[PDB]
Design a protein around this ligand. Structure first.
Ligand SMILES: [Mg+2]
Ligand SMILES: [Mg+2]
Ligand SMILES: [Mg+2]
Ligand SMILES: [Mg+2]
Lengths: 195, 222, 211, 226, 233, 196, 204, 195, 196
């Protein structure tokens, strides 16, 4: 649970997240899905300390699902990201903070726009065209800075994402066991089962 | 435990003109919040039309200057009174500094003079010996206050020509000695206002083909 | 800091940034991070500039003395090894150095990475410094052996730019060098500020940055 | 910082320098270190600057409320007792080092207070990084039965010693005189011996020098009618 | 590397029109214990120099012997040892300054702060400081330890800059020094009432005054001070 | 600091120096370490000035309230209040206090309360950093039922030596005399006691 | 590690003739990594402008906090808050976290709507007020800014001249700071008009 | 420079060594040969601290090559391993020890036997049928314990080695960039160029 | 440890307790801390017993060799040899030594050499952990040119108090008298000195 990438293209947001989980010197799992659906058109990927990541993610999920039922309405990606940020900003000055970094990929149905938010465990929120956490950006941002356009198709975004993963696979010392890729658009959330 | 190092404050500044060079520095010597001397010269004439200032830990600075002056003396003896070129002095100092790589002279050193083509020259050193030639360099306590100002007023950084709106840079016109001295004085006056270790007095040494000249200016004593 | 160097059809390219910092304070905007050992040898610089300057200038002495004794230019392999052997004497004492030794000899163009650990690696491409990861991305995706001198120079130049932009401790200017069998050729100092805007326009890259 | 307090015939005077520092950098060249607790009870503070204000305001607030409750003019011993008990409670974590002086129906008073809560009485006191320079002057020139003019002179001379000799102190001298049966007179910038000399050059730029990408009007007004 | 054991506090000095003055108390403290009350910390070298030393006393006694040996060695094969080739203040200082810096460079310092005061052959006043780090500086007034914080401010009111030196007489300079020593006695917890004072004048030579005492002290106001705030009795 | 309390025929006398230090700097050279908690119950303070002042103030409050309800308290009672504060808060205090007082029934009494919060009733007590140097002198020269003049001389001579050797002690010698006659403050200056 | 220098950034404010100016860089980073070039550090509540440097999460948090407080102030007072009053509110709000502070360096700038007097102020992290007549600086390049401002500044500058002065103070200070830059914004404030300009600078 | 395996089969010794070299967070090389030929029928692979590994290996190589020339004779694998062990045992009590673990694969031409020696940086020597250093054994030894026979062919040894590498590639968190495999037999030393 | 050396009319007397501790355990209760380095030059030792014994042995060797070449050494000379060892090896020593001796020319002399290696010639000297408690008593009761009996009483009374208060000191009081008449050893037991 270290590698999470995000890229916002023309009409969708794409989140790529590693599949590895390591305990001690042994890789326990190579098919772990480091993501939670907060609402039909909002997906959150996460990375950080063991345990805290899932617990936080599920806690956020429960709160957004509670809001959805109460108001019979889906919160905008912006509203969700602000809620999440506050929870982390609240958490950093707690007795034991939740050591969790997240990417929130959502499609705003009102504005008809994809939106990617990057939030670290301190509660540092930024809206970006593409983002990453930890050291993931060190390897990938030079490629994204070069190739990224805001009018890219979903297929072009996936191709640029493949190049980012290939560079990670070449220059990163750790084996992260490939990535699970998910797309968030007007029709909702779907997983790219071949990557 | 014994700490062999200390900080005597002080700030120095070297600027290279087209046919001259200046090396300036405040005359205040301090420890912690006390003043030791309001006038303790820091920039020296080392001979062969070279001026030098070792800023930082005064004891190591006095030792390095003392050694370099000695290196000049022996250069004359050994090589038939040949003049020591500024570039040769620079390389020599590198070796003086690196001889203590594992117990350095805690000083940031600058020398100024003229190159073998008669143009202005300034060389800047770190405590361990790395060096390089520059046009403008402030060293010491208030270096961070002064260098941005010099980037702006000497190399005309971030300054463009009116009407073009960032398309055409301000041309890099050469500065006169009088113009440089103004920038030096205003640099130190500004530093004195916002840095407690800077004050008392300013001594500037100007190097031309005619020789070395000194200029002194008062600074605020608070 | 950011430095790289790579072999290709017509020699080796060497590109470096120019920044030096003292914490958050930028102490130098223009620092020569390439060492002209001799007309056929170059050395990059990573870590302690003092240690890079001193030991590589001392290497030049040894390389010159070699030529005088043997009446033949020293190889890149041998030169790189003399340097690594100097490092191994002060093994553990606290030296800090990461340099690529670039040159052309009998075996063609040559490139060796040498670090304070005494490590000595041969390879077609290397990059060191706080911004090497950004540089590698551009390099890996655009590098070919079939590169022209013009394109290769641009690649090394563009790869430093990538690092200068993202890395806080990299920037200032780009220094280019091209190493041929007739020696090395300096291809100038390129301000990053000016280069960035230029590349952004011509290339279309850095869309996220407003200009 | 350099602050002092000096008793005299019919009252007391305090003084201070005007330099505030963050390490070796001067944040403010004309800081105000003389604080008012009540109309005729003033204090000077050294140490952590946010603490010297915060604590002087808090006690000043409670003093004012106490004065209203008791229908009496506040006493210096009241401010002293409230300050030290607050400071003691926080065991020095509130880095306030104060010299408290004033006049009240009881007479004229001069005290010092350290951050841990200890207090002292005296005819002359000094606090701060320049306290040793100031005290040297006070010990050389202080005497019993000083006049108002002699005390102001001694006080400002002691601050000057700190200004010139202490790197943590500088700029100007502030003074406040609290005499019995009179209004307290606060003399802001009583002395100004450190005016910056005129610069050699004007650094006013030509209009159009800075490169601009975008311009826009900022709507600071509220939502408009119609 | 060591730590000082038996210590000597402030040494103060200043220049005046025709020479220099230097003073230092006669105490050898053992931490907070005022152990030794008959310690001379001003050491004359010839008739033109006085070296005042603060800090570790065992190191002071070592330096005292180096200077005594220096005088002996200078006289060797030197017909002009009591004339043109006599020791100067500048010679004595530079020697000490060399020793101090060398010792710190071996990480085995002489734990001291020294002030060499004297008058040169040409009548010039000499006053320069050196300490355990090998740091040197010169000023119209010099003081070590506490003297730097309390004495200098007072002495600088008399001689604030170089141009004030000719205007300052020996009577005024001595008075300022003696006042400073009183202030240090009031305020330095490691000071003593007894002290020594030396004057090196270019006309009247070296005048060494021993067994001086701090006098004209103000204490009477203490009777009126009661409690720490609210106490009246 | 150098402090002591000595019982004699007519009552008790407290004695103290007047120096307060912050390292080697004398923050106050005219300190009053003789503190009043009741009319004829006083204390000598050593240790953290902040701590000893805060304690003495609380004690003065307790005895003032005691007096309003139950009349004049005993010196023993005062010592118990000091002890209760010093013992229960020993982890956060650095206070060495001597309590001295005069009753008509009990006459002059002295209690010492060292760091731990223990209590010890004694004919006389010494404390502070400078007390170490006069343990021998005081043991040799103390007598029970001395006269007022003899006791003043004993304290004066004792603190004179404590001041002489202890750098943390000095200034003037303050004394407070507690008898049936009332409360008398005394002061002795350096020129007087140094020549002893 | 040092919270006040993880994310980086700078703010500077200046007074002129019947005007004030406040400016900030646009960088947000994770130490050496540049993360955003659109992270504005200046906010406004009515006609009062607040620049905040330091730890980004606290910058965002405090903006939302002062938006909250100024919105209630206005509903109760039936008027917009003034710079002098707001300055005290910022001071109060920071000191209430004296032993768990926000790692920030706020800068207030504005013009009193009644007196028309220009106003600027700076604070330390626990709310110590620095009410300077001339200029205020904050951030990772505050030393650099002090040096520029102290020499470039002169009193009673006209709006369009002040712009050049503050812009050059910021730009050249940021170019000597590794953790500042990536863009810059300048606000020029007058009693009833405010102009916002984005500056062109090197992107390294 | 962490993974080195060795297996002694019927008529040869096979050494497998990783190709990765990492500096900081970047993989500098993925084709590094962590081995030196000490003599025509003796190969030594190595792993440990950066720099020390090659320096030690080359120092040993020089000494064995010097011996070979002086005596016009190839030392037995046993003799070479004992020399190497002594140098490491000498080194561990030096001012700055050489932090190097080695495997020595040799074919004894006198006895007509393959021989594998495992020596760690302390000078702990053991002759084994198969060996490894660091954590390599934790993953691979259970497979080797199960499948290994002393009468295995070179081809069977390579197949068992492939299974060991596959298990490493699955359960190890680090990406070691595959292995270079070399065979030591009666005809000398050769490299398996497709693995 | 409690040690002292006192000059008087006819010469000098060294005095010491006899307790050596390892923490709170008394390793030796009859130690002889009065050490002979020459016929009429003795020393009192405090600090590390290993260090002070090794020093005293080396000094005794130097003075024995000095005597063979240049005749009887002075007390000053002996103090110089002690100092030279203690000063040059101050980093690896913990020794507090008092040197006392008798010449016919110079008579009784006392030199003290504290931790640093400094030398101080005095009329009398005190040292050891127990010396702290008698600084006041000794300063008040010392006189120059006392008689032998007066000086013995002074030392006896002084060390009696040092022993009384210092736990590290105790046992018997040993003394050595150095005069023209020769060398006299004295000893005083607890029942004698405790009742003083
Ligand atoms: Mg000052
Ligand atoms: Mg950059
Ligand atoms: Mg030992
Ligand atoms: Mg006992």
């Amino acid at each position: 649970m270290d590698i999470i990438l995000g890229i916002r293209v023309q009409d969708s947001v794409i989140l790529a997240s590693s599949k590895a989980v390591t305990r001690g010197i042994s890789v326990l799992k190579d098919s772990d899905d480091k993501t939670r659906q907060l609402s039909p058109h909002t997906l959150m990927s996460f990375a950080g300390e063991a345990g805290d990541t899932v617990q936080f993610a599920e806690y956020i999920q429960a709160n957004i699902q509670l809001y959805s039922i109460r108001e019979d309405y889906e919160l905008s990606p912006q509203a969700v990201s602000s809620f999440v940020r506050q929870e982390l900003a609240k958490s950093i000055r707690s007795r034991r903070p939740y050591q969790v970094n997240v990417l929130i990929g959502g499609y705003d149905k009102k504005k008809n726009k994809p939106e990617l938010y990057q939030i670290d465990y301190l509660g540092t929120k930024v809206e970006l065209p593409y983002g990453a956490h930890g050291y993931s950006g060190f390897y990938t941002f030079s490629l994204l800075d070069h190739h990224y356009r805001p009018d890219m198709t979903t297929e072009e975004g996936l191709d640029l994402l493949k190049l980012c993963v290939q560079e990670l696979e070449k220059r990163m010392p750790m084996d992260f066991k490939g990535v699970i890729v998910k797309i968030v658009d007007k029709d909702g959330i779907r997983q790219v089962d071949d990557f | 435990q014994f700490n062999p190092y200390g900080d005597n404050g002080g700030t120095i500044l070297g600027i290279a003109g087209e046919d001259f060079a200046v090396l300036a520095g405040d005359t205040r010597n301090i420890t912690d919040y006390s003043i030791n001397s309001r006038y303790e010269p820091k920039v020296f004439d080392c001979g062969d039309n070279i001026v030098m200032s070792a800023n930082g830990f005064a004891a190591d600075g006095d030792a390095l200057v003392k050694r370099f002056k000695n290196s000049v003396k022996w250069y004359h003896f050994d090589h038939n009174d040949k003049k020591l070129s500024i570039n040769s002095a620079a390389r020599n100092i590198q070796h003086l500094l690196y001889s203590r790589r594992f117990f350095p002279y805690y000083v940031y050193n600058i020398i100024a003079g003229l190159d073998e083509d008669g143009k202005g020259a300034v060389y800047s050193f770190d405590p361990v010996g790395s060096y390089q030639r520059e046009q403008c360099r402030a060293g010491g306590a208030a270096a961070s206050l002064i260098m941005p100002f010099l980037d702006n007023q000497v190399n005309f950084k971030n300054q463009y020509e009116p009407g073009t709106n960032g398309k055409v840079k301000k041309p890099l016109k050469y500065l006169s000695v009088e113009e440089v001295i103004k920038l030096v004085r205003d640099s130190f006056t500004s530093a004195t206002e916002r840095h407690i270790q800077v004050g008392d007095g300013l001594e500037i040494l100007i190097v031309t083909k005619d020789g070395v000249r000194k200029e002194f200016y008062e600074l605020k004593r608070d | 800091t950011t430095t790289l160097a790579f072999k290709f059809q017509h020699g080796v390219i060497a590109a470096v940034d120019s920044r030096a910092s003292a914490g958050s304070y930028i102490s130098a905007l223009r620092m020569n991070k390439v060492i002209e050992i001799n007309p056929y040898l170059l050395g990059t610089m990573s870590g302690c500039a003092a240690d890079c300057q001193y030991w590589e200038r001392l290497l030049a002495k040894e390389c010159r003395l070699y030529y005088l004794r043997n009446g033949e230019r020293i190889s890149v392999s041998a030169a790189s090894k003399l340097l690594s052997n100097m490092m191994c004497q002060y093994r553990g004492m606290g030296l800090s150095m990461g340099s690529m030794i670039c040159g052309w000899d009998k075996k063609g163009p040559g490139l060796y990475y040498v670090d304070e650990h005494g490590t000595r690696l041969s390879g077609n491409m290397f990059s060191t410094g706080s911004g090497n990861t950004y540089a590698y991305g551009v390099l890996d995706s655009n590098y070919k052996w079939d590169l022209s001198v013009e394109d290769a120079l641009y690649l090394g130049k563009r790869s430093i730019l990538a690092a200068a932009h993202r890395d806080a401790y990299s920037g200032g200017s780009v220094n280019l060098y091209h190493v041929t069998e007739d020696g090395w050729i300096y291809h100038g100092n390129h301000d990053v500020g000016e280069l960035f805007w230029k590349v952004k326009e011509e290339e279309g890259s850095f869309n996220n940055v407003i200009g | 910082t350099t602050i002092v307090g000096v008793k005299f015939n019919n009252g007391v005077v305090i003084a201070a320098d005007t330099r505030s520092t963050q390490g070796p950098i001067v944040a403010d060249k004309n800081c105000a270190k003389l604080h008012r607790i009540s109309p005729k009870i003033w204090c000077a503070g050294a140490g952590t600057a946010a603490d010297t204000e915060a604590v002087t305001q808090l006690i000043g607030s409670n003093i004012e409320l106490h004065s209203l409750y008791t229908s009496r003019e506040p006493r210096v011993v009241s401010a002293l007792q409230m300050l030290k008990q607050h400071l003691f409670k926080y065991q020095g974590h509130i880095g306030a080092y104060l010299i408290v002086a004033g006049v009240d129906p009881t007479g004229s008073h001069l005290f010092s207070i350290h951050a841990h809560g200890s207090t002292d009485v005296g005819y002359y006191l000094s606090l701060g990084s320049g306290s040793l320079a100031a005290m040297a002057v006070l010990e050389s020139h202080w005497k019993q039965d000083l006049t108002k003019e002699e005390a102001i002179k001694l006080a400002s001379d002691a601050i000057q010693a700190g200004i010139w000799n202490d790197l943590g102190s500088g700029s100007n001298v502030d003074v406040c005189v609290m005499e019995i049966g009179k209004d307290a007179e606060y003399l802001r910038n009583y002395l100004t011996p450190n005016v910056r000399e005129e610069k050699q050059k004007s650094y006013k730029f030509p209009r159009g020098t800075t490169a601009v990408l975008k311009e826009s009007i900022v709507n600071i007004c509220d939502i408009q009618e119609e | 590397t060591q730590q000082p054991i038996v210590t000597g506090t402030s040494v103060i000095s200043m220049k005046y029109d025709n020479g220099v003055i230097i003073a230092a108390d006669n105490l050898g403290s053992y931490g907070s214990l005022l152990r030794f009350n008959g310690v001379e910390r001003l050491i004359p070298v010839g008739d033109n120099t006085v070296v005042g030393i603060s800090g570790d006393i065992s190191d002071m006694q070592h330096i005292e012997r180096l200077l005594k040996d220096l005088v002996t060695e200078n006289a060797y094969d030197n017909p002009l040892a009591d004339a043109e080739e006599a020791l100067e203040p500048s010679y004595i200082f530079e020697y000490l300054a060399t020793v101090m810096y060398q010792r710190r460079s071996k990480m085995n310092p002489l734990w001291n702060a020294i002030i060499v005061a004297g008058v040169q052959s040409n009548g010039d006043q000499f006053l320069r400081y050196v300490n355990l780090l090998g740091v040197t500086y010169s000023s119209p007034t010099l003081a070590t330890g506490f003297g730097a914080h309390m004495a200098n401010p007072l002495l600088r009111k008399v001689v604030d800059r170089e141009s004030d030196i000719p205007k300052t007489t020996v009577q005024v300079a001595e008075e300022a020094i003696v006042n400073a020593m009183r202030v240090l006695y009031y305020r330095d917890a490691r000071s003593s009432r007894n002290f020594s004072l030396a004057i090196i004048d270019k006309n009247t030579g070296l005048t060494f005054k021993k067994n001086l005492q701090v006098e004209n002290m103000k204490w009477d106001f203490a009777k009126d001070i009661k409690g720490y705030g609210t106490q009246k009795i | 600091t150098s402090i002591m309390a000595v019982t004699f025929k007519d009552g008790v006398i407290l004695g103290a120096d007047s120096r307060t230090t912050t390292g080697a700097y004398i923050a106050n050279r005219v300190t009053d370490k003789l503190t009043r908690v009741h009319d004829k119950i006083w204390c000598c303070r050593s240790g953290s000035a902040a701590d000893t002042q805060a304690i003495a103030d609380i004690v003065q409050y307790h005895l003032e309230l005691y007096t309003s309800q139950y009349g004049t308290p005993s010196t023993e009672t005062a010592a118990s209040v000091f002890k209760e504060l010093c013992y229960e808060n020993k982890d956060n205090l650095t206070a060495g206090i001597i309590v001295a007082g005069y009753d008509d029934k009990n006459k002059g009494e002295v209690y010492t309360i060292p760091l731990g919060g223990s209590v010890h009733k004694l004919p006389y007590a010494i404390a502070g950093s400078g007390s170490t140097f006069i343990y021998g002198y005081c043991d040799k020269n103390f007598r029970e039922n001395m006269s007022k003049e003899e006791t003043v001389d004993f304290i004066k001579h004792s603190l004179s030596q404590a001041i002489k050797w202890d750098g943390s002690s000095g200034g003037v010698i303050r004394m407070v005399v507690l008898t049936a006659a009332g409360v008398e403050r005394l002061i002795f200056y350096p020129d007087e006691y140094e020549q002893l | 590690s040092d919270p006040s220098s993880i994310n980086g950034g700078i703010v500077v404010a200046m007074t002129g003739k019947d005007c004030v100016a406040i400016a900030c860089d646009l960088r947000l980073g994770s130490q050496s990594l540049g993360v955003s070039n659109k992270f504005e550090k200046i906010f406004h509540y009515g006609h009062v402008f607040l620049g905040i440097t330091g730890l980004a999460t606290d910058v965002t948090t405090l903006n939302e906090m002062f938006r909250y407080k100024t919105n209630l102030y206005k509903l109760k007072e039936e008027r917009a808050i003034e710079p002098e009053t707001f300055t005290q509110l910022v001071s109060s709000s920071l000191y209430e976290r004296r032993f768990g502070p926000y790692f920030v360096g706020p800068v207030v700038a504005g013009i009193n709507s009644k007196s028309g007097k220009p106003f600027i102020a700076g604070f330390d992290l626990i709310g110590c007020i620095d009410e300077a007549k001339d200029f205020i600086v904050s951030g990772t390049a505050s030393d650099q800014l002090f040096g520029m401002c102290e020499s470039l500044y002169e009193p009673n500058l006209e709006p369009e001249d002040l712009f050049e002065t503050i812009s050059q103070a910021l730009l050249n200070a940021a170019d000597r700071d590794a953790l500042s830059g990536w863009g810059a914004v300048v606000y020029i404030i007058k009693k009833d008009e405010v102009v916002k300009r984005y500056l062109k600078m090197r992107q390294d």
